Amino acid sequence: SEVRTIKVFTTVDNINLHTQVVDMSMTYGQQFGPTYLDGADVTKIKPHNSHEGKTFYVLPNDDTLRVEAFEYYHTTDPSFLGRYMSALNHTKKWKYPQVNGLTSIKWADNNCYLATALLTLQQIELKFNPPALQDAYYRARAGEAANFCALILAYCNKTVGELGDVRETMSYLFQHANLDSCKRVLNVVCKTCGQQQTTLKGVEAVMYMGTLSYEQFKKGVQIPCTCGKQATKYLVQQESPFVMMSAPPAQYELKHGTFTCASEYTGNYQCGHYKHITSKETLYCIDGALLTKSSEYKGPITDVFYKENSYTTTIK
Numbered sequence: 269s270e271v272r273t274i275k276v277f278t279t280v281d282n283i284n285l286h287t288q289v290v291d292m293s294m295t296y297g298q299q300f301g302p303t304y305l306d307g308a309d310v311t312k313i314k315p316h317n318s319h320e321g322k323t324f325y326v327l328p329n330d331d332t333l334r335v336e337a338f339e340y341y342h343t344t345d346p347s348f349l350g351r352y353m354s355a356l357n358h359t360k361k362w363k364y365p366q367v368n369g370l371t372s373i374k375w376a377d378n379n380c381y382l383a384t385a386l387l388t389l390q391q392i393e394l395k396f397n398p399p400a401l402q403d404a405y406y407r408a409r410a411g412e413a414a415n416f417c418a419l420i421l422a423y424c425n426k427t428v429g430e431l432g433d434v435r436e437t438m439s440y441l442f443q444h445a446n447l448d449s450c451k452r453v454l455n456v457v458c459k460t461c462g463q464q465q466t467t468l469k470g471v472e473a474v475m476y477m478g479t480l481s482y483e484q485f486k487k488g489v490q491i492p493c494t495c496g497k498q499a500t501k502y503l504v505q506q507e508s509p510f511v512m513m514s515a516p517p518a519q520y521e522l523k524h525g526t527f528t529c530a531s532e533y534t535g536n537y538q539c540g541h542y543k544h545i546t547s548k549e550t551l552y553c554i555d556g557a558l559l560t561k562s563s564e565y566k567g568p569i570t571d572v573f574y575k576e577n578s579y580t581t582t583i584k
């Protein structure tokens with residue numbers, strides 16, 4: 269039969285595009301392997317006339333693409349791009365509305381934990397290592413968080429419609445960002461066993477699991493010592509742009525101006541709902557596209573963020 273072809277662009281980073289000639293008789297999958305147009309899988313679909321000019325994503329099948337893919341995503345997981353494209357198909361459909369001057373996500377596909385995380389990332393200082401995140405992030409701040417959310421699902425290995433832990437999610441994001449300059453100095457004191465001082469750098473220097481109160485952490489928190497007689501851990505020094513204090517959800521009261529933002533989780537383990545509370549002129553509770561405003565907030569808080577620069581204890 270007659271041979272008909274169009275020119276298109278393949279890519280892995282939608283930054284470097286390589287001109288290709290495709291045969292309409294054959295499916296895209298036969299010609300380039302797995303292929304995706306805006307997350308849409310066209311691997312088993314024959315080319316149309318409309319497809320001409322358009323940019324398709326493909327798996328790296330040569331050293332050039334593998335090098336290009338690694339530079340953009342700081343990863344070599346063969347499934348990665350398929351998952352990022354799979355998530356993207358769904359994420360584009362979501363509506364991201366600007367709520368209180370910050371981009372958020374109207375609820376769908378259990379996206380409540382992402383919206384919450386996304387609002388958090390707009391309020392704190394974070395330089396992502398991989399250009400893929402840097403780039404999607406910049407656009408996410410502008411009001412187009414589709415790719416940023418898609419990349420987050422691909423990076424966090426989550427499937428659309430599956431709920432996720434906001435702390436676990438942010439832990440992954442920090443692991444892929446520049447926190448090398450972050451430093452923490454915790455002193456532990458036992459009446460029996462003495463004082464032991466430890467230094468934490470990187471993610472371990474901004475996240476903490478067991479209290480929501482930054483001030484409590486500074487005053488000191490009781491922890492079980494090796495001996496079996498309880499000992500007190502307290503914060504001696506903190507160099508970081510923020511800190512994340514996390515604990516199992518409990519009834520907490522947030523006062524205006526004493527924090528940056530918290531994550532409220534209501535419901536049972538792994539099947540709850542997430543709401544975002546921010547401190548500005550007054551307290552702001554952001555639930556999807558819904559916004560509530562109040563002077564005082566009492567709810568089951570599980571994560572609190574606090575902007576910080578340099579802090580040193582006045583203890584001893």
Ligand SMILES: Cc1ccc(NC2CNC2)cc1C(=O)N[C@H](C)c1cccc(-c2ccc(CN[C@@H]3CCOC3)s2)c1
Nearest residue numbers: 431432433436516517518533535536537538539568570
């Ligand atoms: C949503 C989700 C997805 C995946 C995972 N898995 C990964 C963590 N490592 C693997 C966890 C999560 C989770 O539920 N994240 C909340 C903050 C949380 C964290 C810790 C404990 C609890 C609760 C225990 C009992 C409860 C009943 N409800 C309370 C009782 C008082 O107020 C509300 S919640 C919840």
Ligand SMILES: [Zn+2]
Nearest residue numbers: 458461493495
């Ligand atoms: Zn001890």
